[PDB]
Amino acid sequence: APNPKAFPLADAALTQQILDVVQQAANLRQLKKGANEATKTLNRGISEFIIMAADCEPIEILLHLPLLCEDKNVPYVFVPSRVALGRACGVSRPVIAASITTNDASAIKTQIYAVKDKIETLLI
Amino acid sequence: EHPSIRYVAHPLPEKINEAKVSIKAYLTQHERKRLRRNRRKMAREAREIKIK
Amino acid sequence: FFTPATSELIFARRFLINYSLERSRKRLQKEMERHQKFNTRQELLSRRTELQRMANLELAGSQLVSTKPISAVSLSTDDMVVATGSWAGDLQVLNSQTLQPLTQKLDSHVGKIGAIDWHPDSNNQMISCAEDGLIKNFQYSNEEGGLRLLGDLVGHERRISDVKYHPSGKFIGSASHDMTWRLWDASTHQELLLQEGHDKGVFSLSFQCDGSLVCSGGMDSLSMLWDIRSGSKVMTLAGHSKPIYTVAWSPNGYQVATGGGDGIINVWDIRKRDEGQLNQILAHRNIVTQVRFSKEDGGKKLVSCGYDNLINVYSSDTWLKMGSLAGHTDKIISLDISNNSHFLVSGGWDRSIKLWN
Amino acid sequence: AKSTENEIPNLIEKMVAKGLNDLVEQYKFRETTHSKRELDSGDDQPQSSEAKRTKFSNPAIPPVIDLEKIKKLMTVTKVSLPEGSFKRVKPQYDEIH
């Protein structure tokens, strides 16, 4: 079962949507995988929204990213499966953190925005 | 007495029927390439055999 | 179904029943009196005026607070100062009308502040929750400094959403992302209840102001009205589709009002035994964060803020968007209304508190 | 599990066949996963065409079945009659009986 501190966890459909978005971004180079890269993105400001893995053990290695997001007002979720996330990113190896980055002239801008909105809805 | 002041209830938590959306598991570029390489290779082999 | 017991609860439960009952009776009497002496014209006119006033509120003062966003904004019982929890784990307090700080307290919570409530006994010992996973009472002094904590109350395991004070002052209810909602003994700081009645967490509580009934709004969309005394429920989940992030009663026990993720504020539980909604209200484009009323002290006026960048106000008979409140730049996560008057204090993701006058 | 028991040899080859079948449905992002294959089978169910495409996929994914078969096939040839009824094949010559 998934971690309590990994919050907000997505729901299934939402998770799927997010992964699709990630995949799209990966194809368009508008994504960055990896805790450290996510952090970098956040620092820059380029992060549109952050996707983490709930099933990161030891969860602690993420649980700065959420804080960062909060302090930068970037929405964020955890999805459940790090394997799935990795696959979406385009990496066989299992991944914990990714960042869909900003770029006005993306084909997938609209889609990304939708996902962002959804993420925001979750937060409270 | 009619509604008791002794007991603490723990009623049945109604679990909502969640729709199992079987996940689109994606592939790595490399994985995709491998898939393409192997199927195509197999096909080629078949052709060769079914022509040699 | 699955029914054990405890002695402290029993001791308290009788008291609750007594207190609730007398108060309830009084309320009923008041209501009766009201109908008896009212008229079509003047009352209606007054209501209209009130509505107009609400509409023509504008953003008076937006005072920033904290690094992270402002989870909770709670106006004192006295109605003089407001308390503002931010996500960092700090609960600054501001003299409402001017809106200037008294102190800061980062070393209180480590996690995200949940809700802050003020104690209904004017003697100001506000409570506040967190994802931190513990509630803290704070004996507030205007002069001494700012806040001193009294007692911490470890009951829940997971992160908390919302605490309230039961209108007596002897109890503090707290609901959490764990499955339960838990009522506390104000004096000794020890638990009694734990209603495991939702498949996901209890995201919000709300006591009825008479003191009989508590609506537990769950993350499941199962809003359960618990007779605390009985441990017995008069529920409708058939309100909401997404999670019930808030619930709050018209102080006139007459109504519960649950605000949602679906955005639709559902105002139900009525004299009507069929339990049908006089209405559902379309509150905010995105989600609803807070719902409030204000008939303590004045008249009954629904007010809600959302993740749409708008507060708005609804007539407690009609249920209508009587007026949008543009004022925040970003999301609004919490709000309170001035008991006596027209004077809203609301906060959020803009990372400011804001007044409306 | 029951489904697996009846029709499904549940090896690597079978899995491959299943994958192929799902692709032939249409499926883009590698259609759907297999916990025990059961889920995959269920998913396929709407498409409804299962065990034919392993009786093709083993002929391609290797040709060992083909080899076995060899160790044949008759068309409606010129002057079938149709009393005549035999046609073999072997690579030096198309041997007709």
Cα B17 to Cα C31, C220, C338, C347, distances in angstroms: 43, 11, 42, 36
Inter-chain CB proximity C5 and B13 less than 8 Å? no
User: CB–CB of C136/C108 below 8 Å?
Assistant: yes
Residue with tokens 């719902």: C291
CA angle C195–C200–C205, rounded 5-degree value:
50
Inter-chain CB proximity D67 and B42 less than 8 Å? no
Inter-chain CB proximity B6 and C5 less than 8 Å? yes
Which residues contact residue D81 at a Cβ distance below 8 angstroms, ignoring those fewer than 6 apart?
none
Q: Which amino acid is at C73?
A: V
Give dist(CA D72, CA D91) in Å, integer. Answer: 13
Residue D51 burial class via C-beta count within 10 angstroms: exposed 0-12, middle 13-18, buried 19 and up: exposed
Which residues contact residue C317 at a Cβ distance below 8 angstroms, ignoring those fewer than 6 apart?
C47
Residue B28 tokens, joined? 């790595």
Q: Which of C196, C187, C137, C190 is nearest to C163 (CA)?
A: C137
**Which residues of chain B neighbour C195 with C-beta distances below 8 Å?**
9-10
**Which residues of chain B neighbour A88 with C-beta distances below 8 Å?**
26
Judged by 3 or more CB pairs under 8 A, whether D touches C is no
Inter-chain CB proximity B42 and D62 less than 8 Å? yes
Which residues contact residue D57 at a Cβ distance below 8 angstroms, ignoring those fewer than 6 apart?
D13, D16, D17, D20, D21
Question: Could you give the maximum distance between any two Cα atoms of chain D, in Å?
Answer: 55
User: CB–CB of C303/C336 below 8 Å?
Assistant: no
In the DSSP assignment, the letter for residue B45 is: H
Please report, to the nearest 10 degrees, the dihedral formed by the alpha carbons of residues C64, C65, C69, C74 taken in order.
-100
User: CB–CB of C304/C290 below 8 Å?
Assistant: yes
Residue C142 tokens, joined? 């205007």
Structural domain spans, chain C = 62-357
Give dist(CA C223, CA C216) in Å, integer. Answer: 6
User: CB–CB of A54/A6 below 8 Å?
Assistant: yes
Residue with tokens 């995949």: A23
Residue A109 belongs to domain with CATH number: 3.30.1330.30
Question: Could you give the maximum distance between any two Cα atoms of chain C, in Å?
Answer: 55
Q: Is A113 on the interface with C (CB under 8 A)?
A: no
Can you give the residue range of the structural domain that contains A47?
1-124
**Which residues of chain B neighbour C198 with C-beta distances below 8 Å?**
13
**Which residues of chain A neighbour C245 with C-beta distances below 8 Å?**
124
- Which own/partner pairs from C163-166 qualify as long-range (CB within 8 Å, at least 24 positions apart)? C163/C114, C163/C115, C163/C117, C163/C127, C163/C128, C163/C129, C163/C135, C163/C205, C164/C115, C164/C117, C164/C205, C164/C206, C164/C207, C165/C117, C165/C118, C165/C119, C165/C120, C165/C127, C165/C207, C166/C16, C166/C207, C166/C211, C166/C214, C166/C228
Per DSSP bridges, beta strands C81-86 and C125-130 are unpaired
In the DSSP assignment, the letter for residue C144 is: S
Which residues contact residue D74 at a Cβ distance below 8 angstroms, ignoring those fewer than 6 apart?
D85, D86, D87
Alpha-carbon torsion (D87, D88, D89, D94), positive or negative: negative
User: CB–CB of C122/C81 below 8 Å?
Assistant: no
Give dist(CA A91, CA A101) in Å, integer. Answer: 18
Residue D97 burial class via C-beta count within 10 angstroms: exposed 0-12, middle 13-18, buried 19 and up: exposed
- A12: nearest CB among B21, B26, B31: B21
